[PDB]
Every structure is written in C-alpha cells, then in structure tokens.
A paper describes a structure:
The globular head domain of each monomer contains an enzymatic active site, whose activity plays an integral role during the viral replication cycle. In particular, the NA cleaves sialic acid residues from newly formed virions as they bud from the viral host cell surface.
N1 NA expressed as N1-MPP resembles previously solved N1 NA structures. To verify the correct conformation of the N1 NA head domain (residues 82 to 471, N2 numbering) from A/Michigan/45/2015 (H1N1) in the recombinant N1-MPP, the N1-MPP was first expressed in Sf9 insect cells and purified, and the N1 head was obtained by removing the MPP tetramerization domain from N1-MPP with thrombin. Ten residues that are different between A/Michigan/45/2015 and A/California/04/2009 (H1N1) are located over the outer region of the head domain, where residues 199, 247, 263, 269, 314, 372, 389, and 432 are solvent exposed and residues 240 and 321 are buried but have similar hydrophobic residues. N1-MPP and N1-SPP exhibited high enzymatic activity, comparable to that of the positive control, N1-VASP, which indicates correct folding of the proteins.
Numbering used by the authors:
A (entry chain A), B (entry chain A), C (entry chain A), D (entry chain A): 82 to 169, 169A, 170 to 306, 308 to 333, 335 to 336, 339 to 392, 394 to 412, 412A, ...
Write the structure that this text describes.
C-alpha cells in the first residue's frame, strides 16, 4: 500500500464507455434494497465502491414514507461494491449522515458524514472506519459537503463544505485532511458566488472542483486550489449551461448567469485547458435525460458551439444528481488520471405518484476508443405495491 | 497480532461524536432481521463488531411472539459488523446464550455465553470460536454476566458474574481469563451491595466496572480491580443518579441510594479522578431518552451540580440498556484508551402494543473536538403487520 | 497448512457443553432458508462448518412439497459456518447429492456426494471443490454413505458405503482416500451384519465407526480399521440400546439384538476401552428427545447399568439423526482429539401435519468441566403458512 | 499467480460426472433470485464461477415481465460461485451487457460485455473489473459474442464476435486479447458459413471453437486458430447433428446441412483427432432433454454411428443453451486440460404460460471413471404466483 501520487494529468477522452448499472429500484420492487439518494463512486487502489446515504428504510416498505425529506436522524452513509444493489446483506456501514463525502488516499478510506442539527450540524470524519476528527457548523444553517468523492494527493485529501443560505450568499471553506485529521482550512473570499455539492478531482498534483450554484447561477461555479489551499474561483464560461434548471443554450458568462439560476442540481465537469467535458440534463426545467458534451473552448469561451454530444439517458427518462470520480494510475496502471462519472436516476417524489423517493445509478468511464450514445434509464414502472 | 497492552489511561473527552446507527427495527419491518436484545460493541485491533443475543426469530414473524421473555433455549449470541443490521445473511454465530460477554485480547476473540437452566446455568467460554472452559451456577438462581464487553490487559481478559436473587443480596464473582481459560476467580465480600450487568473498561493497566443495582440502589455500584483480582468497591456518589428508575437529582450517597433503588437498567460511567462521565435515561421512571452528563466531582461528591450535558436521545423516545466499549490504541494509533458507549433502543413490549420486543442500537465515541446534542431515536412506527 | 496427524487419543469427557444451535426452521418461517436434512459438522484446522443436503427448495415455499422423499435430482450438498442458517446468501455449494460425506485432511476439503439413479448411483468425490474421482453402485440398490464426517489420518481420509437392501443383508465397503482419489478399498466379510450411515472418528491413528443396523439390530454395529483397511467388526454390547426404534433397556448382546431391530436412526458412540459414550433418543419408538449416557463397561458388557446421563433434548420434542464430529488438536491446541456430536431436529412429516420435512441442528462438545442437562428443541410451532 | 500455459492436450474422457446444479428457478419461487439467461462457467486457478446476463429483475416480480426479450438497457453481466443461485446478496457485478464472454488468463479476470444499440453496439472489455478497451459494431446489426468462456493461452485470451444478419451471411471476426486490450483482429473469409455463440476451448496451445449456424446449418460450424489468428474453418461432419432444431440423424455433411438448418441453439463439442464428444438436445424440434454422444469418427465421418450415449436431461424436460468450459492443470494439478460443460435449463416463455423467462444451470466434468446417465431437470412447477 502506497499513498496516491495524484501527480499525472487527466487523460483526454473521446467518449464515455458504460461501467456500471445497478437497477436498484427495479430489483427493490420485491427484494431487500435500501432507500437511498446521493449515491457516488470512489475507488481504492484495489476496488471501486458505490457510497450512498440511506434513509434507514427499504423500498416498498412503509418506512420509505416521506423520504423526499433530505435530512433525518435515520439516514446513514453505507457502501457496497460497484454495480451491486445497496442491500443490508452486502453493504458496509460507514457513518450516520445526511450529507457526505469519501475517498481513499492510497492506504485507507476517509469518510466524512454530517449529522448535528440544522442548527449546529457536526461532520464526523472516519479514517479506516475510526472517528478521527469533527467539525461543527459555523453558520448554524445546514452544514453540508460534496455528496461525491474527495480528492487525494500525496497523502492529503481535500474537500469543500457550505454553511448558510442556499437562497443567498453562504460561506464556503476548503479543507486539507491527512489520515482523517483536518490539517488546515480556509474561508473563501467569494462574494456573489455560491458553492454546493462540489464534484472534485485531482489533476497534475492540484485539485479542481465543479459545483452547484443554488442561488443565482445556471452555469456551474468552480474552484481550484493547490495543496496549501491557495485557491482560484470562477464560473464555467461556456454557453452550454451545465446546471438544471437553466436557460436554453446561448452566449454564456464567466460570472453567474442570472437567468434560471435559482435552484440547481449536483453536477460535474472536467477542465482541459480552455476545453471542458460538460455533463448535464437534457430537459432545461426538470432532471430528465443526461448527455455528455465536449466544448473545446467552453471553459473560457462564452459561445454555445460544441464538438461532441453523447447520449447517456433518454430525454423522457428521469435523472438526477451527477458527479465526478476518478480511477488513479495506481489502480489502472495507466500513465494519467482516468476521468469517470456517475449518474443518479431519481424515481418517486416529487415527480411521480409515490410515497417514497430513491435512486439508481449508472456510471461511465472516459475512453479514446469507440463509444455510442444510448439511454440507460432506471426502468422501473411506478407506482409500487406500497404505492 | 500482539496482545493488547491496556496500559494507557482513558482519554479525557469534551463531547460524544456519533459513531454508528443501525435502524434495525425499521429495516426489519419487511427485511430479514433478527429479534435481538442486549446488544453491545467490542472491537478487535482491526474491526468493531456489534454482538447481540438473538431470540432465534425474525421481526414481523410469528416466532417473535412473547419475546419479552429474557431466557429460552432458542436465544443465541451472534455478531455482525458495526452499523449493520443483525441478519442471518451477514451475522457470525458465536454461542447459544441468554446472557453474554465478549472481548478481544489482541490475538483472538473470547466469548462467554450462558445457558444451563435457571436452576443450574452453565457459561460456555469460546476462544476463537472454540469451547475452552465452562463454569456452572453456584447459587442455582440465573447465572448471569455483563451483557457488554469484557476488558483485556496483557493477555488477560476480566469479567463479572452474578448468581442469586435480583430482589436481594446475591453473590458476585470476578474472573481472570487467559485464552478462554479461567485462570483465577474470587467471591466479593460485598454485603448490602448488588451487582448486575457490569459495563467494564481497562484503564492504566487495571479494570473498572460500573454496574446495575437491581436490589435497592438508584446510583450505580462500581468495582475496580488489578490483574490479581484484588478488588475495591463502592457506589458512585454523584447526585446525578445514573440508574433507571431513580429519584429526581438531589444530594447523593456514596452507598446505595434506597429511594427508587429497586429494578434498574444496564448502564455505564467513566471514572476520571474525582470526576465522572454519566450516561443515563432522561425519564426517571421508564427508559425514555438518553443524555451524557459530565460531573467534574461526581465520583466522590454527593452534590447534583454538573458542568456538561449532551443530548443523545429525545426524552419522548424509547431507550434501554447502555454500555461501555473502548477502542484501544492498538486499533486507533492514539496514545490513550478511547472511551465510547452504545445505546439500546428497545421497541415493542412492555411499553408498546406489540407481541414482540427488540432493539436497535446507536453508538458514540468520546472526542475533544466539537460535538452537538440531538436525538437519534429508533424511529420505527409501531405496531407492525404481525402487530 | 499441515496434514492432520490423527495420532492422539480421544479426550476423556465428563459432560457435554453446548456449542451451536441454528434455529433454522423458526428463522425459515419467513426468511429464506433451505429445506434440508442429514446435516453434519466437520471442522478444518481454522473453522467449523455445517454441511447439509438441501432439497433445492426453501421453507414455507410450495417447492418444499413432498420433501419427505429422500432422493431426487434437486438435492444438493452445501455448507455454511457453524450455527448459521443454511441460506442461499451464506452457503457454499459442494456437490449434487442425496447422500454425502465430508472432511478436511489438514490441507483442503474432501467431499463425497452421491447421485446416479437408485439403479446405478455414482459418488462424486471433490477435493478443494474439484472432481477428483467417482465410484458407481456395484449392487444397483441405492449406493449410500455416512451422512456425517469422514475421518482423516496422515493425509488419508477414510469412509464407508452401503449398497443393497436396507431390509436384509447388503454389501459394505471401506475406502481409503488421499487428496480426493480412492487409493484402496475392501469389501467386508460381514454376514448377518448391517451397516448404514456410519459416524466415524479417528483415535490413536486408527478409525472407529459406529453405524446403523436397519435390518435386525437395535444396538449399534461398529467397525474399526487401520490405515490399510484391516478391519474389525462387532456390535456394541451395552444393554443401553443406542438405536431407534429399540426395546426397553435390559441385558444386551454383542451381536444384533433382534427385538425392534428393524429400521433405525443414524447415530454415534465413542469407544473408551471397555466404556462407551452413548447418544440416543429418549423415546423407544419415535425420534423424540435426546440424551447422553456414559456406560463405563458398555462396549463389552451386556448389562444396562450406566453412570452418567445428560439431558440434551426433552422427551416430548422432536429429534432425528445424530452423528459424531471431532475437533483435532491442530485446530484446538489440545493434546488429544476432542469428541463432539451434532443432533438433527426433524420437523414436519412424517410426524406433523405439513407438506414438508426439514431439520435444525444443535451441537455439543465434550468437556471435563461442569455441564448441565436441559432441552434445546427446534422450537418452531407448526404448521406454517404454506401448511 | 502465473499465466495459464494452455499447452497440454485435452484429457480423453469416458463419461461425464455431475459437478453443479443450482435449482435457481425453484429457489427463486419465493427467495430473491435474478432473472437470468445465457449462463456460463469459467474458472480461475483458484475457483470456478457462474457468469450470467441478468435482466435487472427478480423472479416472481412484475419486473420479470417480458423477459423473453433478449436485449435491453437493464441487462447486466454478473457472477457468483458455482452452484449458488444468482442473487443480489452473493453476486459480483461484472458489466452492463446483453451479450457477453469471460475468462481468466491465470492472473486476473477478463470480461467482455456488449451494449450499444442494435444500430451500433459497443463491447466493453474489463480486466480485473477495470475498463481496458472497447470495440463497436462494424455492421450495425447486433454486435454479439460467445455467451461462454473465452480461451486463454500464454497471457493471451481469444474470442469470436458476429455482426450482421442471423438470417443470412454475416461477418465474423476473431480477437486476440492481452490484459483486456485487443492486440490483433482478423475478419474471416467464410462465405456461406454462419458463426454465432461460439463455445471455445484451448487445446495443445491452440484454440478450437464450436458454434451455432443460425442461417442454414443443422450441424455445427467450427473454427480453429493459433495465437496469430491464423484460422481454419469447417463444419462437424458427423451425422449426429448437434444443433437444434435439426433433422433426424442420418448421413451428415462436412458443409452446412441445409435441412432444418435455420435457427439453432448455442452448443459445444470437443474435437479429439477424428473423434468428437457431441452434446445436444434430445428433441429435434424444441430444446428438450440433453445427451452426450461419443462419435469416434464424427469430426470427419458423415455416418450416424456412435459408440457412447450418456443421459443428462430427460427428453420431456426443458433445456436450452449449452457451452464448453475447461479446468486448467494450473487449477486441477492434472497433466492435461479437463473438458467440462454446462447446460442452461430455460423455464417460462416461450414454451410455458408465464410472463417471464429464466434459466437454471447444471454442469458436468469429463472423467474416465464410472458415470451414469440420469435426468437433472430444472424441476420447478410453473406457473408461479406472478404467473
Ligand atoms: C405515509 O405518511 C403519511 C403522512 O403521515 C400518511 O398519511 C396520513 O395518514 C394518517 C392516518 O390515516 C392521517 O392522519 C389523520 O388524518 C386523517 C384524514 O386524512 C384522519 O382520518 C385521521 O383521524 C381520524 O381517525 C382517527 C383514528 O380513528 C381519529 O382518532 C381521529 O379523531 C379522526 O377520526 C388523522 O387525523 C393523515 O392525514 C395522513 N397524511 C396525509 C398527508 O395524507 C400515510 O398513511 C403514510 N403511508 C403509509 C403506507 O404508512
Ligand atoms: C402469540 O402467542 C399468544 C399466546 O399463546 C397467542 O395468543 C393465544 O392464542 C391461542 C390460540 O388462539 C389462545 O388459546 C386459547 O384461548 C382462546 C381464547 O383466548 C381459545 O379460543 C382457544 O380455544 C378454543 O378453540 C380451540 C380450537 O377451536 C378449541 O380446541 C378450544 O376448546 C376452544 O374452543 C384456546 O383455549 C390463547 O388464549 C392466546 N393467548 C393469549 C394470551 O391471548 C397469539 O395468538 C400468538 N400470536 C401469533 C401471531 O402467533
Ligand atoms: C403438494 O403436492 C400435492 C401432491 O401433488 C398436492 O396435492 C395435489 O393437488 C393436485 C391438484 O389440486 C391434485 O390433483 C388431482 O386430484 C384432485 C383431487 O384430489 C382433482 O381435483 C384434480 O383434478 C380435477 O381438476 C382438474 C383441473 O380442473 C381437472 O382437469 C380434473 O379432470 C379434475 O376435475 C387432480 O385429479 C392431487 O389430488 C393432490 N394430491 C394429493 C395427494 O392430495 C398439493 O396441492 C401440493 N401443495 C402445494 C402447496 O403445491
Ligand atoms: C406485463 O406486461 C404486459 C404488457 O404490457 C401487461 O399486459 C398489459 O396490461 C396493460 C394494462 O392493463 C394493457 O393496457 C391496455 O390494454 C387493456 C386491455 O388489454 C386496456 O384495458 C387498457 O386500457 C383501458 O383502461 C385504461 C385505464 O382505465 C384506460 O385509460 C383506457 O382508455 C382503457 O379504458 C390499455 O389500453 C395491455 O393490453 C396489456 N398487454 C397485453 C399484451 O396483454 C401485463 O399486465 C404485465 N404484467 C404485470 C404483472 O405487470
Ligand atoms: C509521480 O509520483 C511518483 C511517486 O512519488 C514519483 O516518483 C514521480 O516522479 C511522479 N511523476 C511525475 C511525472 O512527476
Ligand atoms: C505499554 O505497553 C508496551 C507494550 O508491552 C510497553 O512497551 C510500554 O512500555 C507500555 N507503555 C507505558 C507508558 O507504560
Ligand atoms: C503426532 O504427529 C506428529 C506430526 O507428524 C509427530 O511429530 C508426533 O511424534 C506424533 N505424536 C505422538 C505422540 O506420536
Ligand atoms: C507447458 O508450459 C510450461 C510453463 O511455461 C513449460 O515449462 C512447459 O515446457 C510446457 N509443457 C509442455 C509439455 O510443452
Ligand atoms: Ca442553479
Ligand atoms: Ca464553445
Ligand atoms: Ca423478504
Ligand atoms: Ca436500581
Ligand atoms: Ca457534582
Ligand atoms: Ca435398528
Ligand atoms: Ca453397563
Ligand atoms: Ca423475501
Ligand atoms: Ca441451425
Ligand atoms: Ca460416426
């Protein structure tokens, strides 16, 4: 076991090849499957796992009632092997949490699970499943984190957290964590920015985060930083708007695009020089569909011209959160960091006539060989017996 | 693999950070979950496990009928990873038992499971799952033990057992066990004391046990001893009464507090010099709620003044047994022994209109970083389909 | 990994301490548990497992219908950890089989699973789960074997098989197996003897088998042999008759006791010089109850006087097959071979108004410390929802 | 870990000894079992696994509806230990796929899972579960592969794929894969041949594939090649026709036998000089029954005379796909490559009045010791509760 270097560059990719699909809600129709949301993938040097926040209940059970609510004392962070349904019989317990992050530094797992009341939430940090540190809300307004993987470089793992209104300017801090212990932190000087649910990846020894602006931006804000938490911020300039909801594609902005900027969805993007791989919903108003768009100058250009589009989920099928995850050369044997992504396909409320809300997941990896667009939807036919 | 030293002191702590929550009864509403009671946690140098006494039946099944009864030939001691529901598909069989203890000496697991009729019960000792010794009732009145973890120091593990009335003076013996073999035992000279269900931990090479007085004490009795079974006894003097039921807090006693002293609940406390961390119910009459109270002079002072209170379970929510467990530096890499505790949240009879009784569990670990009180209740809505 | 020596003597024992109980049929009331019969235990140098012949169906399912039938193409030999219920989610597949044996030689598992039609059955031998040899029926009348563990000594494992009438004289052959390969075999010259379902154990470098006489003996026949298959035969002389059905205890015979000698039950006994540990049913006509009886001269004496009786299963509770299993010093660290036994508790047909038949299991190990009799019954209340 | 040599010859065999039977559909009657088809076995140097294409649904669940359809975005390739039912609680996720192959090169697993629309399918190659390469349809007509194990020799694994009409001449390419990376490929010059679902095995450092002619041949086509993809092609000449449907046995052809040549079934055969071990259906019109036939000159002779027939599945019981798999000497310790085969027993549509289609599996290994014919059918009684 050797700590991840995190010193190679992102691998340029031409398309996305399908990696996993769990069919959790269909299997959950009769079988014993957790009610979950906020799934995300993270890999160790040996295996890849699906992390998820359960609601402490099973599908098609009465306790799945009201699971449109995001936070409660019953939600717990657990994990299972990629592609497998999150079941009590195959899942590892990670932490009690309604907001989370996780990553492997090359030696052991780091987990961050937030509980503590909305009035004063506390993040529980675990290293190899043992509590190693905590950090409590400093704004008393729903302390919250990535809902995707943290990024690790040379024995250090890095993440972001938000505390404050999701309806206005809040406070965002970046953390450097070593062996589950917070080593240093910094408050961003980001007036008029909004950061939530960052999807972060390492690239050439530094970390880049693409996040969600729930306040007033339909493009995605980003933050990049070195190991000392020296930061840079901005918004993706491409007119290929990445958030949901959003306007129809047009001339973009290097600042928050106010039109349809309120609310949003967790998402991701990969920066390549002036170019960007953008993952987004197909519908501009609800989380339907999913597509990957290559915009060769979208990081810095405000135009709406792109070069490649790959279908991921059909436009009439439900989608949801999406996030980045990487496979390090220590795992793959490649000479660069492999970009991958996962997609949450949310079924039930608020779009469907159920008493419950849960998601399935699909994942893809970036390749330079041939790929094809298709639709890999959840595919469950709702409602269920419980309704 | 190296035997646990057990030679460092307890880590002083400022609050308790949540470690696990299993939601067993809610998940058990439809899924396959054991009917259990008397859960407790114990860790090896590599992992932490939840031990429990099953009743040999599943939740929401007819065989869960009458599970308010504590002893029967169907109850068995099994274990699973922390935070996971006790299921037949993820649980390791330990012993046939209606009273139990368990611990890791640094090399392998020691288990103690009692069966034998109330007229003549026999404790089955297992080391690495192999029977290594037995000890039979010497008073012919329900031989019984900790229902929490034993304590290990330098290759020796130590525990307590009771035989006799729970309605009056009984007989209590302390045991030194090495590799599952009883090495030495001693009968306490404890007239007017009552010891049941001790929660024991090691501290600076000696073991301290905080127990339950079911006869006539609403404060908790304690016993401390060295490796040779040289013992000291007393009651926690703090007016913060730790047992349940109990009187309202007032001036305490260094002897058994007779007021509301009958009956009780398994509990724990951590001794720090003259100070004590007290875990107790919030209601004085039924096992509702749970709270942690720091009484800087409560071990030896009879006053009711305390310095810190941390909410654990809301006052209107059901609780139950609680017990100590430790994480040794051999596991954590710390330079002191980490205090933790678990809480059993009993649902069903006798408080609720069910045919069955079972519990879920939550656990916390002591830290010096920021924490917050909240309520982490079982959260199942009873009754169930079976009723 | 070192091959088992098998060169120490049996450990003298004073009582039997309970080792495992699975509660399979009660748990199977709702949960997913195999329909099984003929369970038996065998240990490796690291773990102990329950082997069993499934009927390829689950409890409380329509496919459990008619499972009173012993042989069919759907029965398979599988195994799980001791004490755990045989479930599709925790069970290892061993072989397709309606008659079986298994053992560990110190290096890997040997399995023997018989299929082939009653007209021509074929035993499939597996070593580390890989087919290594076969042997087909030589009498074309239900080739069958121990239904308990084989015995291993210095890299060789030994067993017995029967082919022919169970209503009269049949043919019995002893096998020496090395790494799953039959090395040598011999046909017994046993006129007027009947051998079925031998429970075999090693003792001081030789193997002893206690079996079932289904033809005309209510005492148990035995066979002992060295590694070259040089054999000795006889019947246990004790008037403590070990088979079921059987007469009331009286003066025994060193030959087959004709009274109530027809039919029988798989059983076991441990030979100690002229003494014997006898396990038997409590009822003389049906498989109810179970008890352990020490008859200090019962191997060679025809009297009915015994010294010790230990209750195992109450007289009004259903029992069934019983068999020997040993724990070798290579596993325990003892200086002798530990005698243990298991009991099958058959529920359903033919004694109960069900459509199905299945069993649970209990097991005990011999000790010289204090023990107690009790009753550890199956405890399920029949019939079930399927009936 | 050492790469498989693949340099020994096939072991001559006299009969087939039963190796596994999963009873998946019967167990699935109540328990949680995947809807699957196209099962196949492949072994590593340590274990043997059942691979299968799920339909992302469970038996006796509404989502099993319409599972007669072969391709959809919900089907995924997963695996479990041999003999165990494919369940979400014991199955490893492999790939998203409606057509598949898998094999172990001695070091790690190679998986090939095809998705991409019928208009442009993409094969996802995984090595140790990590995507290593892709190949997309070149004829835009359902890119498809073996549905059985690939063959590995000296660090290289080899397989076949088809693209084009199954109603006429299509295009077939052979691939050499090293560590999950396609190293070289070649298009066959096979006018008037048709290759689908090849069952491939290594033999004396070269690979032989026996396949399915869905266009116009009732005998099976074959392809053999060395490591450089230098190929030879033909049809099995034996009048023992191997495909289904097929004519009654008569004088065969070394070319495609046009009579009843349309449609077919995945199958296998083992070439031994001029001889052949033929596995086939018992019915000539539907996939009923299964039998093994030794035709000592059937590879090159057009006659219908054979020497050995072994019953595998009774003529009135449902069967389906069959395929080859081998156990290498690296696993067995033998001095030759062991021939084995598996059989899929399809239950439900289109032969039975259900809403669903799924299969169980049986497997056998070639031996020179005594064997017997019998019938090992699926044995489930349909329809089920869902219908
Ligand atoms: C998922 O959660 C939903 C939210 O709680 C549940 O809906 C709730 O169901 C409860 C119970 O039926 C209901 O409570 C009240 O309102 C009822 C009318 O809507 C009313 O009938 C109830 O009271 C009457 O009956 C009781 C008992 O006889 C009397 O004591 C009362 O005096 C009165 O006569 C009660 O006032 C909620 O209204 C309802 N909520 C919503 C939003 O609809 C779902 O049932 C639940 N699903 C599952 C599967 O558990
Ligand atoms: C959990 O255990 C509880 C305790 O055993 C069960 O309650 C028991 O249910 C039984 C069976 O119904 C019942 O037995 C007797 O009393 C009945 C009235 O209470 C009476 O009706 C029964 O006898 C009558 O019917 C039988 C059959 O027709 C006749 O042979 C009799 O002559 C008579 O006509 C019988 O006397 C217990 O009373 C009852 N116990 C309690 C404490 O209520 C629960 O049913 C059980 N739950 C589950 C889900 O299994
Ligand atoms: C476990 O297995 C048992 C043994 O098979 C089952 O019992 C069997 O149930 C079948 C089906 O009901 C039954 O078959 C015949 O006999 C019936 C009377 O006993 C008779 O009614 C049946 O035929 C009639 O109905 C059919 C359909 O309408 C007509 O085609 C016929 O012409 C006739 O009108 C049929 O002759 C067996 O008798 C019965 N066996 C025994 C021993 O009782 C159990 O049902 C089964 N349990 C489960 C849960 O599967
Ligand atoms: C497995 O899949 C099968 C294929 O989809 C299902 O069969 C389908 O069931 C649906 C729903 O019942 C049915 O849809 C239509 O046709 C019905 C008559 O066959 C018709 O009654 C339906 O419409 C009527 O009712 C609706 C609602 O009240 C109205 O809006 C309509 O205007 C009309 O009044 C509808 O047109 C399919 O016909 C049917 N398909 C087949 C091939 O039979 C199975 O139900 C399914 N099984 C399970 C367990 O899910
Ligand atoms: C990446 O990290 C490794 C391991 O520390 C180091 O040896 C190597 O120089 C780094 N590679 C590059 C290209 O900087
Ligand atoms: C604790 O135990 C270790 C291991 O035996 C020993 O080396 C060390 O001296 C002890 N530490 C203290 C502080 O006594
Ligand atoms: C038992 O076997 C061991 C291992 O082969 C051998 O060394 C030893 O001499 C034997 N013991 C006795 C008492 O014969
Ligand atoms: C088979 O392969 C091994 C390993 O590479 C080699 O040493 C051996 O010569 C080969 N055997 C034969 C018979 O060619
Ligand atoms: Ca937005
Ligand atoms: Ca652009
Ligand atoms: Ca269930
Ligand atoms: Ca008390
Ligand atoms: Ca005080
Ligand atoms: Ca007899
Ligand atoms: Ca006697
Ligand atoms: Ca179920
Ligand atoms: Ca054909
Ligand atoms: Ca021929």
């Amino acid at each position: 076991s050797v700590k991840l270097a995190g010193n190679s560059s992102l691998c340029p990719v031409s398309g996305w090849a399908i990696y996993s699909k769990d069919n959790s809600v269909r299997i959950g129709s009769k079988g014993d499957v957790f009610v979950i949301r906020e799934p995300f993938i993270s890999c160790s040097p040996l295996e890849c796992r699906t992390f998820f926040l359960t609601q402490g209940a099973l599908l098609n059970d009465k306790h799945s009632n009201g699971t449109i609510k995001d936070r409660s004392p019953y939600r717990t962070l657990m994990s299972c092997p990629i592609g497998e349904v999150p079941s009590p019989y195959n899942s590892r317990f990670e932490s009690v949490a309604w907001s989370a992050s996780a990553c492997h530094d090359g030696i052991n797992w780091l987990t961050i699970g937030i509980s503590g009341p909305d009035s004063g939430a506390v993040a529980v940090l675990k290293y190899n499943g043992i509590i190693t540190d905590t950090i409590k809300s400093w704004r008393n307004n729903i302390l919250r984190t990535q809902e995707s993987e943290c990024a690790c470089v040379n024995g250090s793992c890095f993440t972001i957290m938000t505390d404050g209104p999701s309806d206005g300017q809040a406070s965002y801090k970046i953390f450097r964590i070593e062996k589950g212990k917070i080593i240093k932190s910094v408050e961003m000087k980001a007036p008029n920015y909004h950061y939530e649910e960052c999807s972060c990846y390492p690239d050439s020894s530094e970390i880049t985060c693409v996040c969600r602006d729930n306040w007033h931006g339909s493009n995605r804000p980003w933050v990049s930083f070195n190991q000392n938490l020296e930061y840079q911020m901005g918004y993706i300039c491409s007119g290929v708007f990445g958030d949901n909801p959003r306007p129809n594609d047009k001339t973009g902005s290097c600042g928050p695009v106010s039109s349809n900027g309120a609310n949003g969805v967790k998402g991701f993007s990969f920066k390549y020089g002036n170019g960007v791989w953008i993952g987004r919903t197909k519908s501009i108003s609800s989380r339907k569909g999913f597509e990957m768009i290559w915009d060769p100058n979208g990081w810095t250009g405000t135009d709406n011209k792109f070069s490649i589009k790959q279908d991921i989920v059909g436009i009439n099928e439900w989608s949801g959160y999406s996030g980045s995850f990487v496979q390090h050369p220590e795992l793959t044997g490649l000479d660069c960091i492999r970009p991958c992504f996962w997609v949450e396909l949310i079924r039930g409320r608020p779009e469907e006539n159920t008493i419950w809300t849960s998601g399935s997941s699909i994942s893809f990896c970036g390749v330079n060989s041939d790929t094809v667009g298709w639709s890999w939807p959840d595919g469950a036919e709702l409602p269920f017996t419980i309704d």
